[PDB]
Design a protein around this ligand. Sequence first.
Ligand SMILES: O=C(C[n+]1ccc2ccccc2c1)c1ccccc1
Ligand SMILES: [Cl-]
Length: 548
Amino acid sequence: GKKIDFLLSVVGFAVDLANVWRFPYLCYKNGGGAFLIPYTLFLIIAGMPLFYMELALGQYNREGAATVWKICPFFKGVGYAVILIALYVGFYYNVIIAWSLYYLFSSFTLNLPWTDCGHTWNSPNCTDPKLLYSKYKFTPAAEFYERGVLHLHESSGIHDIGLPQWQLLLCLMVVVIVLYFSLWKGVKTSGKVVWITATLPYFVLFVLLVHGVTLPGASNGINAYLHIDFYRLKEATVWIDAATQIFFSLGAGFGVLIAFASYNKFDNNCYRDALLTSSINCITSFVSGFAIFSILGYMAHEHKVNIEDVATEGAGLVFILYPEAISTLSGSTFWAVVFFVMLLALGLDSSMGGMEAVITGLADDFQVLKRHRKLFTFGVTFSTFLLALFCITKGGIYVLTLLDTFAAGTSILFAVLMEAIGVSWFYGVDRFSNDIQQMMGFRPGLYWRLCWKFVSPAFLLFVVVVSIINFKPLTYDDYIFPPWANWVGWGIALSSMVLVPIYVIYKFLSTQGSLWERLAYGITPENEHHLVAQRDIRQFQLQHWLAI
Ligand SMILES: O=C(C[n+]1ccc2ccccc2c1)c1ccccc1
Ligand SMILES: [Cl-]
């Protein structure tokens, strides 16, 4: 039974709410098949090596995101930046969980609310196929999502967001309460409910893939998926999206892996962990795009619109697609309950780790917070609840879009780039390899060291530069955000990107001694500062820098 338990642990570790909710609309937006060449390339080249590096860092140092930089004291700012990014994401992550819970509540009926026209939320333009370049939004399912759930029709833009929706308010309160009462005792929340939180996503994917293929218009969707538009690969938006999605789904750049692995057995094998997680992620993504495009090809056939106009490209694509596939199944109520229970469980499970990253990273930094976990968890959870309250208004989809685009984009890419720099170049890839050898019994191979030192930082810097210089103003499918919205988003990105130089400056000024002594204290591990008085700093020799 241990092998069954081991398989469940690995397979449930590999799946995340990002894979299920954020990949579909990123694949639809960037053409489908053309989105997986950058996706797989960046996976192989930067996602697997960096996942491995973060796992090994956390496991060896037994420290959270912030304090793990005792190995090079100038990068505690990088730690703080990743904690801030993880805090920012939860604001709207919990809002998606609230949407899932509202849909689950709506699903306990024999006449599902998203199948036909004529409800209190329907407009005069509602078009049911059964009875009877701009995106198509007059379908029963899209109108349900945008009028009976979001109540978006009561907003004009990000300048008139409105007041909180009380239904989503109650759902968000339930979600927040569950998260707190799951996080207030301790970190350990594995092996107790993962039997359903690990197998249900894959069962849902399997039934969706087997069914959608047998739909009237699925062939056209699969063709649009498998036809690769090589012109999209010269635009840099697909590359930016693929990089950000790799880091979103693998957990890198959020401080989640470091905090999670600080609890692993010292001898735990991180090589196999990275290999298995990345392989499962790649196969799952390539198989999930198939089902997405089969569903929306059938939607194109049924609604008689072009496959590039059937559905939104925003955060609600899954909530538009899953209902459409559900209504085509027999016993649609049972299937709706299964799908939305899966979504709710997966979202709660992943948001728990996202919040535990913040709690652990900041508690390992201050002992007062480590002795008072109940109050700290309350504070984190309540601040998240309010700043998400901002996202459940009438025009809260615009704020969720602004956050989704700016909270972890260039900011997360920069943070992970600085992590790779600080470890590989300053701490030493050779010392990092020695630590991995002491932990796991074998030294990392040449491919891993090359990716850690040269290849991954090079591509991360390329993507960061391109994202900064090739930046498209913000939109939601028909709506052009006012310029001050992009300025606000760039301020949000800089708010976490800038913690690095500020901490470097603070550390330099707070230290005592001469310039060279200050640099030596700044780039030397905290438990080797007594060598500085001996004027033996390895970073001050060319040999340390020419290593591989
Ligand atoms: O990234 C996450 C949750 N997450 C995603 C992917 C993972 C992969 C492996 C291990 C843990 C993981 C956790 C998050 C959630 C809410 C706020 C901020 C960050
Ligand atoms: Cl993904």
